[PDB]
Design an enzyme around this catalytic site. Sequence first.
Site, mmCIF file in Angstrom:
data_model
loop_
_atom_site.group_PDB
_atom_site.id
_atom_site.type_symbol
_atom_site.label_atom_id
_atom_site.label_comp_id
_atom_site.label_asym_id
_atom_site.label_seq_id
_atom_site.Cartn_x
_atom_site.Cartn_y
_atom_site.Cartn_z
ATOM 1 N N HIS A 206 36.556 44.776 47.628
ATOM 2 C CA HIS A 206 35.517 45.356 48.494
ATOM 3 C C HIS A 206 36.084 45.409 49.901
ATOM 4 C CE1 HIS A 206 33.048 43.155 45.347
ATOM 5 N NE2 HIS A 206 32.474 44.335 45.231
ATOM 6 N N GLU A 209 32.655 47.277 53.628
ATOM 7 C CA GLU A 209 31.355 47.630 53.097
ATOM 8 C C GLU A 209 30.269 47.722 54.180
ATOM 9 O OE1 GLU A 209 30.075 45.074 49.835
ATOM 10 O OE2 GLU A 209 28.267 46.308 49.491
#
Lengths: 402, 402
Positions: A206, A209
Amino acid sequence: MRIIKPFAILTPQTIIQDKAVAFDKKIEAIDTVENLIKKYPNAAVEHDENSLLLPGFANPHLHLEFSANKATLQYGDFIPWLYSVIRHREDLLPLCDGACLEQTLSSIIQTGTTAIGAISSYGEDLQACIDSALKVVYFNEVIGANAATADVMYASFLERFHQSKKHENERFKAAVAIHSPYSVHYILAKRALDIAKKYGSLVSVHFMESRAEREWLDKGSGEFAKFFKEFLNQTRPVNDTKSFLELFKELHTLFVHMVWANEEEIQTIASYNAHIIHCPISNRLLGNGVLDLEKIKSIPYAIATDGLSSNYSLNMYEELKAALFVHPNKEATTFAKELIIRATKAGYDALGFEGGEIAVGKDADMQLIDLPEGLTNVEDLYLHVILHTTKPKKVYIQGEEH
Amino acid sequence: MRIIKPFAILTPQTIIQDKAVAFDKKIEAIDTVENLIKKYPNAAVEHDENSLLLPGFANPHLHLEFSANKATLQYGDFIPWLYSVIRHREDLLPLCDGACLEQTLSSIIQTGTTAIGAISSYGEDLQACIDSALKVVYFNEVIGANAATADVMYASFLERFHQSKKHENERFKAAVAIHSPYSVHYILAKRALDIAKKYGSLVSVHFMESRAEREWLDKGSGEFAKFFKEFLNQTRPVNDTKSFLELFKELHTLFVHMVWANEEEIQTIASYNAHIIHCPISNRLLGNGVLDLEKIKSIPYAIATDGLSSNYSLNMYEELKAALFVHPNKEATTFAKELIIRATKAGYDALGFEGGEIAVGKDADMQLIDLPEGLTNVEDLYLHVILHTTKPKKVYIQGEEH
Ligand SMILES: [Fe+2]
Ligand SMILES: [Fe+2]
């Protein structure tokens, strides 16, 4: 061997009419029925003159372990969501038992997805994933921002990785995930990525984000500061962003979310073997905004749903509708075509499977869907597929109908 | 008299728990069951402890006559859409026969809408609308940009208006619509609006739906110029915008779309008895962009779907999901609440009916829907209603369940 003659084939890149598809495990030929039966006299022919054939979707990013969530986690803002995950996961995770996992995976197939990237933090979803007919890249995720407890986090990751690795075959791949640049200290990340290097494993992370992440990594300030102070007793980000990103230079990496990535990061990632995974619903619902597709145009992207921890469904058709709406100034007929390509071929490319395209030699991973009625302009087909479809009539994985 | 005890009531403005609703034709009381049965010993009590009560939706703008469209009209750009309407309407309109109209209206109720604003261009939808249990404002639309044929257009409008007017009652209102400032010459518009003045009729107008309209009205140039040259043999806009807008000064008007309205127009309309009707799906699909809710904050707005001529459904829950996504930077939990209010109370206000609110004295126009499971934070209820609901369990119009 079988032959299907639909109204049209979305390859996905082109619309083919007046041809059929011969397939067994793989797509063997695309030609008129007249020509196909000369080559394949043993193949029964199904005429579906009010249907379309398109590839099965890839959904390269989903957190299956959170599949019991409906309204338990906090939406609207990323850090409150993360607090809610921390608060509720001990109860939420076991609520998704074997039956929940099995049903969730079956529903993915029934909505036209044939390949997934499963992000697994605890490994209790392994049995369900190996049991599924889906193609699965099973990303064993590591987390840990405290260098002093890296050994424990690493040992758990390693055990989960090897537990998954014994199940590898043509449809199931063991992989590695790094939670994020704020939550995985550099040294632990590097140790996990060295396993990926050793085995040639796919990697997921990730990345950027939320704006909170952006400000924390850039300046050591902002809304994440209170979180790190309270939750981790840390006053500063443990990682230098550029050094962290460089860990991925020699790997095949899925960079997930990417909404807040900057120009320098984008240039770096464009030089890597990398794909961006765009999760429009999750980003919008968590107060993270919308990925700008011009800003990231130098890096290929694919569409995913994220888990039910930050989505109301795992249906790619719902994701594609939302994608149309969160990029509202992209002309609809052309953007719909882009979206269908990015939900099929691009996601298969991200996951490293031979599918996502109705082309000779690809696996016969396909959807048969109803043709939207009254179609005047065939170039509008991609848009009308997104708007009017929610469930395929038939879904094939390596030629087997489910 | 009946009593329903749900988990919660969305009024819509507030969330009430630990109370029930007593109703017959109207909502009579909101109190604990204990207190209600003292007043209403004759009322059976339904306990629906895993449900929510909210008002029925209003959908103040829909073109019912186009309800056979699925993929026949051209999406992506407004002027090509309009050409497609002109090309296909002679065949498309009769395809929506009585059965199609009846089914379409029944489906509106089944998706939780209890009041509509029907825009009727040809009047062949009158019987279906009077037959429906819905509350209906039946807007008789006029069109005509050629002053020389105003008499014929006016006579048709007048006949349709009077045909509808004989059916007026508490739930059915005869009304007037002006197609737009580019398509209805000033004098014809004024003649139709004089009928509205005479009878105190509600009025609807499409206003600044597209940038082409903006440029045509402002400058007499742009993409509409070719259209007017070819289709109407006109070189210039027949109307002065400000003069046209002033025709509405003394009427109750619904200004539909409004995406391209300017600051001066907004200030003028804010001084009128006026509502904006926001149609997010239609605007996005026709390449018209997204209404800016800050820009129009001085004028109350309500949500509508438009017709199936520029939408894939007439389901308000789908419209509300799309609204979340086309305004992606509005924090989700608070925006969802705004949306629910603007789909119920605001639309009832726009249509002039006594409903859209669960409050004593309002008509019992209500939906009973499933409670999203696992809800931690009750303030998130509005968001989870939009995300997880597609069909109410029960829908009441003036207390009658459908
Ligand atoms: Fe994720
Ligand atoms: Fe309209």
